[PDB]
Design an enzyme around this catalytic site. Structure first.
Site, PDB file in Angstrom:
ATOM      1  N   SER A  15     -20.148 -12.116 -42.216  1.00 62.28           N
ATOM      2  CA  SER A  15     -20.453 -11.355 -40.997  1.00 62.28           C
ATOM      3  C   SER A  15     -19.256 -11.466 -40.012  1.00 62.28           C
ATOM      4  O   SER A  15     -18.100 -11.220 -40.426  1.00 62.28           O
ATOM      5  CB  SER A  15     -21.781 -11.850 -40.378  1.00 62.28           C
ATOM      6  N   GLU A  50     -26.935  -1.709 -45.023  1.00 59.13           N
ATOM      7  CA  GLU A  50     -26.512  -2.408 -43.838  1.00 59.13           C
ATOM      8  C   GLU A  50     -25.590  -1.570 -43.017  1.00 59.13           C
ATOM      9  O   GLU A  50     -24.821  -0.772 -43.533  1.00 59.13           O
ATOM     10  CB  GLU A  50     -25.967  -3.844 -44.109  1.00 59.13           C
ATOM     11  N   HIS A  94     -27.457  -7.166 -44.915  1.00 65.06           N
ATOM     12  CA  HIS A  94     -26.499  -8.097 -44.282  1.00 65.06           C
ATOM     13  C   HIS A  94     -26.609  -9.567 -44.773  1.00 65.06           C
ATOM     14  O   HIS A  94     -27.614 -10.197 -44.579  1.00 65.06           O
ATOM     15  CB  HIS A  94     -26.725  -8.088 -42.759  1.00 65.06           C
TER      16      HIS A  94
END
Length: 294
Positions: A144, A235, A265
């Site tokens: 991320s 995502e 994600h």
């Protein structure tokens, strides 16, 4: 065709989502992330260290090869996340790659805005080099925000004359602080996980969102080592990953992008209950191993 674990996991995640546009205070999200974090497998050993003025743990699954290390950069939007939140997933990446991970508690925004996180990652990598790990026995990985940070750390290291490690694996990288990509609209409804702009705001604190070290999708990637990029089909960050891949390729980097159908994600982090999570992590470690044998 969606496995039953992902369908169920999606329903659970929508069940417990805070409704869109509720303002959750920072310290409340931080605490929530900590309290829901998965416990690392009982065969993961851990050792607390200080690295470049940050807390860190060596995270060692069984089967770790001497001489090998992963610099691991955790997600949390540059505003939250910790060693605690990512210990489990990182334990499994260590298992699959047969390498110990250095799991860094880098400085977080807003107390420490950009470029504090990039400074910590580069200094941690420098630290690994100083400890005597050979660059060819090293890998950098992150999820991320952490996955963009992987890329920012490489670029910044490269500019400062540091040698590149053998591989880098961004997982669901957030590599574009402007959050303008098509997939914020096309993938919005499929993604059960705005709030992301507030994180960019807290991280940047005024800085150019197209700074190559904040948003490595705008950086020069020439010279970077081979990349595996994982991203889920469902995502909002799909585009960060498609664009990062094409940038790397333009720039002469050996990129391999896998878009995983139906995945969300950092689906990796749901490994205890998601077969694809366990599967993706095995793939990450295979790739680090391939790159270390080449």
């Amino acid at each position: 065709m969606a496995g039953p674990e992902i369908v169920k996991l999606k329903k659970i995640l929508r069940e417990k989502a805070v409704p869109p546009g509720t303002e959750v205070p920072l310290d409340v999200m931080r605490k929530g992330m900590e309290k829901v974090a998965f416990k690392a497998a009982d065969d993961i050993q851990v050792e607390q260290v200080t690295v470049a003025g940050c807390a860190a743990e060596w995270v060692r699954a069984p089967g770790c090869q001497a001489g090998k290390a992963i610099l691991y950069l955790h997600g949390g939007g540059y505003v939250m996340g910790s060693i605690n939140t990512h210990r489990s997933m990182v334990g499994e990446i260590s298992r699959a790659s047969q390498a110990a991970a250095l799991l860094l508690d880098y400085r977080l925004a807003p107390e420490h805005p950009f470029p504090a996180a990039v400074e910590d990652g580069v200094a941690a990598y420098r630290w690994l080099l100083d400890q005597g790990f050979k660059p060819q026995h090293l890998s950098i990985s992150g999820d991320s925000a952490g996955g963009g940070l992987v890329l920012a750390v490489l670029v910044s290291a490269r500019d400062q004359g540091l040698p590149m490690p053998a591989s880098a694996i961004p997982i669901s990288p957030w590599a574009d602080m402007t959050c303008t990509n098509d997939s914020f609209k096309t993938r919005a409804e499929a993604d059960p996980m705005g709030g992301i702009n507030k994180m960019a705001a807290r991280y940047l604190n005024g800085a150019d969102a197209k700074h190559p070290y904040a948003s490595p999708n705008f950086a020069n990637l020439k010279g970077l080592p081979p990349l595996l990029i994982h991203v889920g089909r469902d995502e909002v960050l799909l585009d960060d990953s498609i664009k990062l891949d094409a940038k790397a390729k333009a720039d002469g980097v050996k990129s391999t992008l896998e878009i995983w159908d139906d995945m969300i994600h950092v689906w990796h982090a749901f490994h205890p209950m998601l077969p694809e999570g366990k599967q993706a992590i095995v793939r990450v470690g295979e790739f680090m191993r391939e790159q270390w044998a080449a």
